[PDB]
Amino acid sequence: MENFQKVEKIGEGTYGVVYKARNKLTGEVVALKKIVPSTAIREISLLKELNHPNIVKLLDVIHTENKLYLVFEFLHQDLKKFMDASALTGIPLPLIKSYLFQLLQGLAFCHSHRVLHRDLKPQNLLINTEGAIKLADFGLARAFGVPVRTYTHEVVTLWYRAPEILLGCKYYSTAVDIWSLGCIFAEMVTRRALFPGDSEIDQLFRIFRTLGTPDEVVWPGVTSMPDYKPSFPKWARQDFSKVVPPLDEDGRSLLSQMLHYDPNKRISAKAALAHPFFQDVTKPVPHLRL
Ligand SMILES: Brc1cnn2c(NCc3ccncc3)cc(-c3ccccc3)nc12
């Protein structure tokens, strides 16, 4: 770590503080994350080769004095801040579309190598002045786990958690990331979180009130899941036209396939890239005030 000069704190991550830092040598400006079982070291080390333009580059892993530091490529803004900033007018549809398209490419890449994110959320979607958006923290969950609270005691958000995780499926799939991204897509369009649960049951019930309480018809095997209870209330499903106005039919159709209950039926990232919603996709430049 003596090779880096911290510039400022840029975030409170799941596993530790995240700093903007300068490589005291090359002058490189980076993001430095403070986070060791050998399995974690091997898993993380593998992420160094998982490179794609829509994944924040993992530059190096530093293990010293039994402390772990991850050095990443630096980006100037995150999607949470960008969305807050664009609240008054909303993010233009062509930009939301470009972002979704790019994020789907990042997921398709990671998923092809059998790597899951498992904790996608606006805070870990990073943007630059060129119109790019990238996923940060891919693979860390499998390496370190996903805590209930952060090292700061901050509550880890449930808002984007897939229903199979909430229902106790132990061996969830790449579909969990498609669910999260669908939640984020709806939030960009409406300017409000889709399912802002504040406990596991609130999160589940918020999903059920919008998408209908799942049953054996829409999700074969659901009633057997570890945390499923026959006493869950039976709510009816709402129309997407009410949920994400005024998203067009193509967008509502895609969102519906990203939020399918049955993870087996949920659209894959690769199939989503082929959806008609992306027929007119472009890459606009966002207006960034740094
Ligand atoms: Br890797 C990583 C690379 N950049 N980066 C950024 N950049 C955005 C930013 C935010 C504030 N000041 C300057 C740049 C934020 C976070 C982050 C980590 C945890 C929580 C929130 C954001 N992680 C990262």
Short mmCIF file of C-alpha atoms and ligand atoms in Angstrom, two decimals:
data_model
loop_
_atom_site.label_atom_id
_atom_site.label_comp_id
_atom_site.label_asym_id
_atom_site.label_seq_id
_atom_site.Cartn_x
_atom_site.Cartn_y
_atom_site.Cartn_z
CA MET A 1 0.00 0.00 0.00
CA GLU A 2 2.95 2.38 0.34
CA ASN A 3 2.72 2.58 -3.45
CA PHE A 4 -0.55 4.57 -3.25
CA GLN A 5 -1.55 8.01 -2.01
CA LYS A 6 -5.17 8.23 -0.94
CA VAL A 7 -6.93 11.21 -2.43
CA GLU A 8 -10.34 11.03 -0.84
CA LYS A 9 -13.03 8.60 0.26
CA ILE A 10 -15.41 7.95 -2.60
CA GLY A 11 -17.65 5.39 -1.01
CA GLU A 12 -18.50 3.02 1.81
CA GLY A 13 -18.48 -0.38 0.20
CA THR A 14 -19.96 -3.66 1.33
CA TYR A 15 -16.55 -4.87 2.51
CA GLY A 16 -14.77 -1.64 3.41
CA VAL A 17 -13.97 1.93 2.55
CA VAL A 18 -13.33 2.82 -1.10
CA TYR A 19 -10.84 5.50 -1.85
CA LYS A 20 -9.80 7.38 -4.89
CA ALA A 21 -6.00 7.01 -4.90
CA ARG A 22 -2.93 7.81 -6.92
CA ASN A 23 -0.22 5.27 -7.72
CA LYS A 24 2.72 7.14 -6.17
CA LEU A 25 4.73 5.81 -9.10
CA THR A 26 2.99 5.62 -12.48
CA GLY A 27 0.74 8.52 -11.45
CA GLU A 28 -2.27 6.31 -12.31
CA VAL A 29 -5.50 7.36 -10.59
CA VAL A 30 -7.38 4.33 -9.24
CA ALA A 31 -10.06 3.19 -6.82
CA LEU A 32 -8.63 1.33 -3.85
CA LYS A 33 -10.87 -0.98 -1.84
CA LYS A 34 -9.97 -2.21 1.62
CA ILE A 35 -11.51 -5.64 2.28
CA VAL A 36 -7.36 -14.03 4.38
CA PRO A 37 -8.73 -17.48 3.55
CA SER A 38 -6.91 -18.99 0.58
CA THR A 39 -10.17 -19.74 -1.23
CA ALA A 40 -10.97 -16.02 -1.32
CA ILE A 41 -7.48 -15.21 -2.62
CA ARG A 42 -7.74 -17.76 -5.42
CA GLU A 43 -11.29 -16.71 -6.37
CA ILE A 44 -10.44 -13.00 -6.43
CA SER A 45 -7.21 -13.57 -8.30
CA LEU A 46 -9.22 -15.27 -11.04
CA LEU A 47 -11.29 -12.07 -11.51
CA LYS A 48 -8.16 -10.32 -12.81
CA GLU A 49 -8.67 -12.09 -16.14
CA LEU A 50 -12.42 -11.44 -16.35
CA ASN A 51 -12.00 -8.37 -18.57
CA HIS A 52 -14.68 -6.60 -20.61
CA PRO A 53 -15.40 -2.94 -21.47
CA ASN A 54 -18.51 -2.94 -19.31
CA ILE A 55 -16.83 -4.42 -16.24
CA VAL A 56 -14.74 -2.16 -14.01
CA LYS A 57 -11.17 -3.36 -14.49
CA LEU A 58 -9.61 -5.19 -11.50
CA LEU A 59 -6.00 -3.98 -11.82
CA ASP A 60 -4.37 -5.74 -8.93
CA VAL A 61 -4.84 -7.61 -5.70
CA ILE A 62 -2.62 -6.72 -2.74
CA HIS A 63 -2.41 -9.04 0.30
CA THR A 64 -0.18 -7.73 3.10
CA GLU A 65 -0.09 -8.00 6.89
CA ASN A 66 -3.14 -10.19 6.49
CA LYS A 67 -4.97 -7.22 4.96
CA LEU A 68 -6.56 -7.32 1.48
CA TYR A 69 -6.67 -4.44 -1.01
CA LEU A 70 -8.24 -4.47 -4.44
CA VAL A 71 -7.06 -1.88 -6.97
CA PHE A 72 -9.63 -0.98 -9.62
CA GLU A 73 -9.96 1.29 -12.62
CA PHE A 74 -11.48 4.65 -11.44
CA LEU A 75 -14.76 6.09 -12.80
CA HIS A 76 -16.03 9.56 -11.93
CA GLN A 77 -19.68 8.93 -11.05
CA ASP A 78 -22.08 6.14 -10.05
CA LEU A 79 -25.63 5.56 -11.30
CA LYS A 80 -27.20 6.27 -7.87
CA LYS A 81 -25.74 9.81 -7.92
CA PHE A 82 -26.56 10.28 -11.61
CA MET A 83 -30.17 9.28 -11.01
CA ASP A 84 -30.50 11.55 -8.00
CA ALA A 85 -29.03 14.33 -10.13
CA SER A 86 -31.47 13.60 -13.00
CA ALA A 87 -34.54 13.41 -10.74
CA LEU A 88 -36.22 16.62 -11.87
CA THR A 89 -36.28 15.63 -15.52
CA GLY A 90 -35.44 11.90 -15.57
CA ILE A 91 -32.77 10.19 -17.65
CA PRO A 92 -33.67 10.39 -21.38
CA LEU A 93 -35.01 7.05 -22.71
CA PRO A 94 -32.25 6.72 -25.33
CA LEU A 95 -29.63 6.93 -22.51
CA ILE A 96 -31.53 4.48 -20.26
CA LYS A 97 -31.68 2.14 -23.28
CA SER A 98 -27.95 2.49 -24.00
CA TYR A 99 -27.13 1.86 -20.33
CA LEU A 100 -29.30 -1.23 -20.15
CA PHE A 101 -27.81 -2.53 -23.39
CA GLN A 102 -24.25 -2.06 -22.11
CA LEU A 103 -25.03 -3.64 -18.75
CA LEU A 104 -26.58 -6.65 -20.51
CA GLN A 105 -23.33 -7.04 -22.51
CA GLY A 106 -21.34 -7.01 -19.26
CA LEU A 107 -23.64 -9.62 -17.70
CA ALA A 108 -23.61 -11.81 -20.83
CA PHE A 109 -19.80 -11.79 -20.66
CA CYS A 110 -19.52 -12.61 -16.98
CA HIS A 111 -22.30 -15.19 -17.14
CA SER A 112 -20.58 -16.97 -20.06
CA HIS A 113 -17.63 -17.56 -17.70
CA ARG A 114 -20.03 -18.71 -14.99
CA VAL A 115 -19.34 -15.64 -12.82
CA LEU A 116 -22.25 -14.01 -10.98
CA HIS A 117 -22.45 -10.58 -9.43
CA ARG A 118 -25.28 -11.36 -6.95
CA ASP A 119 -25.52 -7.82 -5.51
CA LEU A 120 -26.17 -5.44 -8.43
CA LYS A 121 -27.45 -2.02 -7.34
CA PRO A 122 -27.19 1.55 -8.63
CA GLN A 123 -24.19 2.23 -6.32
CA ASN A 124 -22.09 -0.32 -8.17
CA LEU A 125 -22.98 0.78 -11.68
CA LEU A 126 -20.32 3.33 -12.68
CA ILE A 127 -20.36 5.86 -15.51
CA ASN A 128 -17.93 8.05 -17.46
CA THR A 129 -18.16 11.10 -19.70
CA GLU A 130 -18.05 8.97 -22.85
CA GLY A 131 -21.46 7.41 -22.32
CA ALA A 132 -20.10 4.11 -20.94
CA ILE A 133 -21.48 2.34 -17.89
CA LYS A 134 -19.70 -0.48 -16.09
CA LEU A 135 -20.38 -3.06 -13.39
CA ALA A 136 -18.21 -2.94 -10.28
CA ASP A 137 -17.72 -5.73 -7.72
CA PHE A 138 -18.51 -8.64 -10.04
CA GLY A 139 -17.58 -11.94 -8.39
CA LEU A 140 -16.85 -10.53 -4.93
CA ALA A 141 -19.96 -12.05 -3.40
CA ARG A 142 -18.89 -15.60 -4.16
CA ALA A 143 -15.43 -14.72 -2.84
CA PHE A 144 -16.38 -12.88 0.38
CA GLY A 145 -20.12 -13.50 0.80
CA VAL A 146 -22.91 -10.89 1.09
CA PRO A 147 -23.33 -9.56 4.64
CA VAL A 148 -26.53 -8.31 6.26
CA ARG A 149 -24.71 -5.13 7.28
CA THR A 150 -21.55 -3.49 5.92
CA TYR A 151 -18.32 -2.97 7.85
CA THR A 152 -19.93 0.41 8.64
CA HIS A 153 -23.08 -1.30 9.95
CA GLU A 154 -25.03 0.15 7.05
CA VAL A 155 -27.87 -2.14 5.97
CA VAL A 156 -27.17 -3.99 2.72
CA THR A 157 -30.08 -3.16 0.48
CA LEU A 158 -32.66 -5.83 -0.38
CA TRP A 159 -34.32 -3.77 -3.10
CA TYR A 160 -32.76 -5.62 -5.98
CA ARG A 161 -32.73 -9.15 -4.55
CA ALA A 162 -34.29 -11.91 -6.65
CA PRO A 163 -37.23 -13.84 -5.19
CA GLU A 164 -35.44 -17.18 -5.29
CA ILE A 165 -32.78 -15.79 -2.94
CA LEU A 166 -35.47 -14.43 -0.60
CA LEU A 167 -37.23 -17.83 -0.63
CA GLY A 168 -34.06 -19.67 0.39
CA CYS A 169 -32.82 -21.26 -2.85
CA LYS A 170 -29.21 -22.17 -2.02
CA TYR A 171 -27.99 -22.64 -5.56
CA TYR A 172 -29.30 -19.67 -7.41
CA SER A 173 -28.10 -18.85 -10.91
CA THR A 174 -27.07 -16.08 -13.25
CA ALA A 175 -30.83 -15.23 -13.41
CA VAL A 176 -30.45 -13.37 -10.10
CA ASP A 177 -28.49 -10.67 -11.92
CA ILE A 178 -31.12 -10.29 -14.62
CA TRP A 179 -33.74 -9.71 -11.90
CA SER A 180 -31.61 -7.01 -10.26
CA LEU A 181 -30.98 -5.29 -13.56
CA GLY A 182 -34.72 -5.36 -14.33
CA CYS A 183 -35.36 -3.58 -11.03
CA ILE A 184 -32.74 -0.99 -11.93
CA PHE A 185 -34.21 -0.52 -15.43
CA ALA A 186 -37.66 0.19 -13.93
CA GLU A 187 -36.12 2.63 -11.43
CA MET A 188 -34.35 4.61 -14.16
CA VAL A 189 -37.67 4.93 -16.08
CA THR A 190 -39.94 5.83 -13.18
CA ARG A 191 -37.48 7.70 -10.97
CA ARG A 192 -38.52 5.62 -7.96
CA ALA A 193 -37.21 2.26 -6.67
CA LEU A 194 -39.47 -0.57 -7.86
CA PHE A 195 -39.48 -2.73 -4.66
CA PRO A 196 -37.94 -0.69 -1.74
CA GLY A 197 -38.33 -3.37 0.93
CA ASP A 198 -37.03 -2.72 4.42
CA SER A 199 -36.91 -6.33 5.62
CA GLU A 200 -36.92 -9.71 3.88
CA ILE A 201 -40.67 -10.21 4.25
CA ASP A 202 -41.42 -6.63 3.20
CA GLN A 203 -39.22 -7.12 0.14
CA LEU A 204 -41.03 -10.38 -0.75
CA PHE A 205 -44.46 -8.93 -0.16
CA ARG A 206 -43.69 -5.84 -2.24
CA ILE A 207 -42.73 -8.15 -5.10
CA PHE A 208 -45.91 -10.19 -4.62
CA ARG A 209 -48.19 -7.13 -4.53
CA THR A 210 -46.93 -6.01 -7.91
CA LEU A 211 -46.24 -9.30 -9.75
CA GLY A 212 -48.83 -11.48 -7.96
CA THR A 213 -48.13 -14.03 -5.24
CA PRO A 214 -46.29 -16.84 -7.08
CA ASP A 215 -47.85 -20.26 -7.28
CA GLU A 216 -47.23 -23.59 -8.90
CA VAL A 217 -48.76 -22.33 -12.16
CA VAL A 218 -46.31 -19.49 -12.80
CA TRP A 219 -43.38 -21.04 -10.92
CA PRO A 220 -43.34 -24.85 -10.68
CA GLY A 221 -41.65 -25.92 -7.43
CA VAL A 222 -42.08 -22.58 -5.66
CA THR A 223 -44.20 -24.02 -2.87
CA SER A 224 -41.38 -26.37 -1.92
CA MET A 225 -38.75 -23.64 -1.50
CA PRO A 226 -37.16 -23.45 1.99
CA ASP A 227 -38.75 -20.16 3.04
CA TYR A 228 -42.02 -20.46 1.21
CA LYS A 229 -45.05 -20.41 3.54
CA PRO A 230 -48.53 -21.50 2.51
CA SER A 231 -49.78 -18.64 4.68
CA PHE A 232 -48.36 -15.94 2.36
CA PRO A 233 -51.24 -13.68 1.26
CA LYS A 234 -52.46 -14.23 -2.32
CA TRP A 235 -52.21 -10.93 -4.21
CA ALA A 236 -53.15 -10.47 -7.86
CA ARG A 237 -50.68 -9.36 -10.53
CA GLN A 238 -50.68 -5.76 -11.79
CA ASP A 239 -50.32 -4.62 -15.44
CA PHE A 240 -46.88 -3.27 -16.34
CA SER A 241 -48.63 -0.28 -17.89
CA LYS A 242 -49.41 0.77 -14.34
CA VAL A 243 -45.97 -0.18 -12.98
CA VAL A 244 -43.56 1.58 -15.37
CA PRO A 245 -45.44 4.30 -17.29
CA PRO A 246 -44.72 5.56 -19.71
CA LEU A 247 -42.32 2.91 -20.92
CA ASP A 248 -43.25 1.64 -24.39
CA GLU A 249 -44.49 -1.83 -25.26
CA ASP A 250 -41.06 -3.12 -26.23
CA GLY A 251 -39.60 -1.95 -22.90
CA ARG A 252 -42.52 -3.35 -20.87
CA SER A 253 -42.20 -6.68 -22.70
CA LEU A 254 -38.48 -6.93 -21.96
CA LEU A 255 -38.94 -5.86 -18.34
CA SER A 256 -41.61 -8.59 -17.98
CA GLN A 257 -39.12 -11.25 -19.13
CA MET A 258 -36.42 -9.93 -16.79
CA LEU A 259 -38.85 -10.16 -13.85
CA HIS A 260 -40.22 -13.65 -14.55
CA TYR A 261 -40.62 -15.52 -11.26
CA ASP A 262 -39.22 -18.85 -12.47
CA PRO A 263 -35.46 -18.30 -12.82
CA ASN A 264 -35.39 -20.96 -15.53
CA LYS A 265 -37.82 -18.93 -17.62
CA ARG A 266 -36.33 -15.53 -16.83
CA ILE A 267 -34.67 -14.08 -19.93
CA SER A 268 -30.86 -14.55 -20.23
CA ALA A 269 -28.55 -11.56 -20.81
CA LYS A 270 -27.70 -12.87 -24.27
CA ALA A 271 -31.34 -13.27 -25.28
CA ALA A 272 -32.20 -9.88 -23.82
CA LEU A 273 -29.61 -8.23 -26.15
CA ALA A 274 -31.65 -9.58 -29.11
CA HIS A 275 -34.98 -8.20 -27.83
CA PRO A 276 -36.79 -5.75 -30.17
CA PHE A 277 -36.39 -3.01 -27.55
CA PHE A 278 -32.74 -2.65 -28.71
CA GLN A 279 -33.58 -2.30 -32.42
CA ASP A 280 -32.96 1.48 -32.23
CA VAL A 281 -30.27 1.54 -29.59
CA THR A 282 -27.67 4.33 -29.69
CA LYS A 283 -24.91 5.60 -27.40
CA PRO A 284 -25.73 9.13 -26.24
CA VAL A 285 -23.32 11.15 -24.11
CA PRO A 286 -24.63 11.93 -20.65
CA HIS A 287 -24.23 15.35 -19.20
CA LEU A 288 -21.78 14.98 -16.37
CA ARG A 289 -20.93 17.69 -13.92
CA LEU A 290 -17.77 16.53 -12.14
BR1 LIG B 1 -14.29 0.25 -7.98
C1 LIG B 1 -14.81 1.97 -8.28
C2 LIG B 1 -14.31 2.84 -9.33
N1 LIG B 1 -14.81 4.05 -9.24
N2 LIG B 1 -15.70 4.02 -8.23
C3 LIG B 1 -16.58 5.02 -7.88
N3 LIG B 1 -16.54 6.19 -8.57
C4 LIG B 1 -17.61 7.13 -8.36
C5 LIG B 1 -17.22 8.26 -7.49
C6 LIG B 1 -17.96 8.59 -6.36
C7 LIG B 1 -17.53 9.68 -5.58
N4 LIG B 1 -16.46 10.43 -5.87
C8 LIG B 1 -15.77 10.10 -6.98
C9 LIG B 1 -16.11 9.01 -7.80
C10 LIG B 1 -17.43 4.78 -6.78
C11 LIG B 1 -17.39 3.52 -6.13
C12 LIG B 1 -18.29 3.35 -4.96
C13 LIG B 1 -18.01 2.38 -4.00
C14 LIG B 1 -18.86 2.20 -2.90
C15 LIG B 1 -19.96 3.03 -2.73
C16 LIG B 1 -20.25 4.02 -3.67
C17 LIG B 1 -19.41 4.19 -4.79
N5 LIG B 1 -16.57 2.51 -6.48
C18 LIG B 1 -15.73 2.76 -7.56
#
